[PDB]
Amino acid sequence: NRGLYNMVNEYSQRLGGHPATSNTEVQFVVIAGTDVFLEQPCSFLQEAF
């Protein structure tokens, strides 16, 4: 709700917050964020296909 340009900068700049991890059987939350990188447009506009 910070604005459209603020949300677009929040999308591309950093993680929106707490995505799934990589190469594990069950999906954890990544906390360090060392070598993972992703975008999530589902969290950007809050709907599911």
Next chain:
Amino acid sequence: PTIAHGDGRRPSKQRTFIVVKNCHKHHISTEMELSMLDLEILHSIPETP
């Protein structure tokens, strides 16, 4: 070699890989028959046409 980083991860040092490959020898053998008769003919001398 290895990229340096800005975030906090365990930085892998100057790695060096030693790998070796061994040789394979191959043997091949076929058998050809030669009778005793023509060999004993060969070990003689000719005098008749």
